[PDB]
Each structure stands twice: as C-alpha cells, then as structure tokens.
Amino acid sequence: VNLKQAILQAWKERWSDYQWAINMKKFFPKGATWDILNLADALLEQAMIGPSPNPLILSYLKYAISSQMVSYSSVLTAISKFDDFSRDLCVQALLDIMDMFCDRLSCHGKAEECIGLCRALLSALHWLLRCTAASAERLREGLGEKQLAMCLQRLEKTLSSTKNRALLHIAKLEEASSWTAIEHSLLKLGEILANLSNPQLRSQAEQCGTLIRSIPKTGFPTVHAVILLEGTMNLTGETQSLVEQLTMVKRMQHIPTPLFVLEIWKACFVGLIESPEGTEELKWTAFTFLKIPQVLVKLKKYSDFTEDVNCAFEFLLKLTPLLDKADQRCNCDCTNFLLQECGKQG
Amino acid sequence: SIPSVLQGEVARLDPKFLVNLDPSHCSNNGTVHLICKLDDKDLPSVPPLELSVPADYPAQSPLWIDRQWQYDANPFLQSVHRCMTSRLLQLPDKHSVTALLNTWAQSVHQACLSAA
C-alpha cells in the first residue's frame, strides 16, 4: 500500500512505461501531482546502492519528467541533498540528469511555487559548489580526469541565460545569511583551480565566477548652452547649482571626460572673446576666470582627473584661428596666465 | 465575453476531456486557445496538447500548436506524433472540435495496442 512498496513491486519484474502508468493511475484515486505525496524521495534511494546503477530506475525516471508526473523542483531538492560524493559514476549520472530538463524552469503555478523554486535553485547552486569542490579535490588527490572539466561544463550552462541571473539575484535579496556560504566556498573555488593551473580552464571558470559575483563619437553642444546661460544673468549664485547641472548632463549623454574638460575650457575662451566690449566684457571674463576653478576643485574632490585633462588639452591646443582672434582683443598670450592660474589652484 | 457558439459546443463534449482555457497568451480577444486535460485510467500520461481557434469559429479551419521535442525520449511518443500527422492530415475542412478531440483520443489506444 506504500509508495516504497509500489515502486518495489514495480521493480520486481520488468515493466515498460504505459503499463506502469496504468498501474499508478489505478492505485491512487487522487493524483496530487505526484509531488506533495513525495514520490521522488524513494526514486533516488534505491538507484544508488550498487556501484553500477541499474537502468530500470533511470528508464522509470525518464518518462515521468517528460510527462506531467514528476515536476522539475522535486528532482533538484533530491539531488541537492545527495551529499556523500563517493563514486564517480553516480556523479556522472547526476550530471546527465541536469542535461535535459534544466535550463527552462517554466513554472506554471502559484507564487509560493516560484519562491520555492528560487530557494531550490539557491540550494542547488550550493550543492553545485559542494560537488565541484569534491570533484576538484578528487583530481587533486589523483595527481585525464575530465570529471571536473564536465562539472564546469555543468556550471556554465546553469548560468548562461539571463533568467538564471534574475532568479539568483531576486533570491539573494529575499533571503538573509544564505549567500555567506556561497563566498565561503567561492574563496576556495578560485584558488583550488589556480593550484591546478590549466591554459584555458581558468578563463571560463573565472568568467563564471565573475558572473556569479555579477549577480549580487558626436559633438554635443548641449552643455555649451548650459555653460553660456549661467554667466548671462544668473551668475550671482553659488558654485553647486552649475555643478549639479553639468555633472548630471554627463549622466544623461555619454560624454568623455577629456571632451568634458575640452568644452569647459572652450566655453571659457568663447565667453571671453565673443563678449562685446564694455562692462559685459569684464563680467564675462570674470565669470570665465573666477568660477571655473571653483567647480573643477570640487570635481577633483569628488573624482583619474589628472590624466584625462592632458588629453583634453591635447584636443584644446589645436584651435588656432578662433583662439588667435582672442589674442588680438587681449593683445597678449592668455595661455600663460591661465596655465599659471591652474598651477596656483594646484 | 465568450460567444455562445463555444457554450453550445462544450455542452455535449465528453466528460473524459476536462478542457480549459490557456493561462498564458492574450484574453478577451478574437483568437482563443484551449488546453486539454485527459483523466483516463485506461490510458497513460501524454502531453496535454493545446489548440488555436481564431474569431468566428464556424466556417473556418483552425490550427494546433507544434512542439516536436516534447514527444521525445521515447519512440512511443514519436509514433503518437506520426499517428497525429497521419490522422489529422485527412480531416475534412471546417470541422468541429469534437472530431479533433476524438481523433486525438483514439490514437492513444491505437499506439498503445502497438506498444503492448
């Protein structure tokens, strides 16, 4: 009358899939999706006793996954509690289990089913870390041993899709003190395979590692207007409004920082020369001379900023005719004064 | 909501089918999809199958979804698929869903007799 009795009497002779399903259907008046009754607990219990696993239990588990009998999470919960890590053949069989029914994880059910799926994959990746640690130490004690080379092949396909990363990251936030053991084995994961140095295994292994830590052109005259509007009339404010404007502008449009400093200085030159003669010339030159160090000191404070301005000046020291037209008005070389002013600002 | 044509259609459908609507895809629109449930002690487990019927179900010929890899890992399922391609290709035009449901039902026995 027992489930263990039922799988046992199925085991004693040779049954194919159709008659087995017919017997299972007549036995229980309620189906109960063959998961809440815990059918899969004894399916892996009797298939691991022998060093060579029997093919009858494998053929029994073949059709139930392909049909609607056994779901996908129940296999993961059982394999996640396999532990032991004694023999290579059942480990290879466990890898071959992962080869077909995984990588899709189409959950058609309730929200609690998806929460259980998320924690099931969390514990599953924990068991992946444990079994790869065992397969690596087996090779370490041995010294082709492609068992670890296929464990990493299992590892790379379990994280290729973006939905795997989404599920792992959305399970990271909802659970506390669960990811601690992930890095507790990840610190060992890199160094063990670094000890067993390979020309190419390290690249893909640490690419998957960087992914598993990843889970937790055109001139832009827009900022020209931004700089030019400030010195027109509203130049009497503080130094932080223009900063929170122009730094945010770099957030919205991809702007290289050398191009940013290039615009910063060419706007200062243009506001100097293109200002008409009178009190507005003095006001514009003062605006371009006295507030541009204030913003750049704060930019250096908040940010690398020394190397990029050299290439910015490499761009800047080519504008010959426009900036030479400024030297007719200014009768002298402003570059010396400004490049001593920058040294005074440090 | 749903037209009365399908309401008269499902009235005298067999109780051995428990067909209901698909949880996915769009709703309250012209095209409808009905995923079938078969609860038979005589017959073993098969993929549940899903249809596709557009707007104005009378006087049109509907279709059925395709998924070749679901009927794999067993040549019995491949024979079921081949029997589906055999029986459905000679079905007449503009027929009702009872014909397709019953031809889907009988092919399970037709493959079980070859399997047994």
Added chain:
Amino acid sequence: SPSLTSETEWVGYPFRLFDFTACHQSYSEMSCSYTLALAHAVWHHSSIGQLSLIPKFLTEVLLPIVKTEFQLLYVYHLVGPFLQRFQQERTRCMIEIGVAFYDMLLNVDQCSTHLNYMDPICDFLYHMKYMFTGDSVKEQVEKIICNLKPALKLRLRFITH
C-alpha cells in the same frame, strides 16, 4: 600638417571638420577649415581651363602625401562635389580620377593598420560607379581589387559586376 598626419587626437566624426558650414559656430579649428572653403569657391569660379591643372597636380604632387586617415577624407572631399563640375566638361577627368582614386586606394591599403570609415567610402565608390564614372575604368580595377584585403575585397563584388 602634423595636426593631420601626427596629431590624430580626434577619433570621432571627422566630416564636421571638412565643412565651413560647421564654422557658422565658433569652429575654426585649423588652416584646413579655410583652405577647403576657398577650394569650394575658387574651383566653382574656375573654368575647365583652370580646373585642368588640378588632376595632374593631385596625381603627381599630392599623391604620396596622404599618410593618415584624415588626408584620405580630405582629398575625397577635395573632388567630391566638383566631380559634377568635372562631369559635363571633361571625360579625361573621369579617366584620370578613376585611375587616381583606384591608385591611392591600394596606396592607403598598403600603409594602414585599421580604418573605420570603409562603409561610407564604399558607398561613395558605389555612387561614383553608378552616377559619376560609369564603367570607364573597369579592367585595372579588377587587379586593384585583387591587391586588396579580403575583408576589403568582399564588399566590391558588385563593383566587379
């Protein structure tokens, strides 16, 4: 100029540097900003007697001077619109300009590591084949195609057609 051949600091869009319409903004960046514009003017004012001195000077003097990526687009802008002014007035201009362009095409191919504007250059080649030159220079073009990089050789099968 060292600002052309040596100073290759600007890596982005260079076509804004080859037009004085962009110099409506305070955008004089080089002597070459002005020299093109007069090239726009003078050769527009020049009749075919004045314009006939240009292609010999280009094919003899200015031919081995193109070394950087900027000079290639500069000499392509130097002929581009005025090809129409060359078109009605001189078939010798078509022969010489097909021979000259396909001569410096292999010259720049021998002395390049990576060039990123091959798509508009091939589009210009399509345009001049279909609009400007027709098929006056065809046979030597096949041998020059045989001298190209295979990646460069791929996108001119229709040129060979």
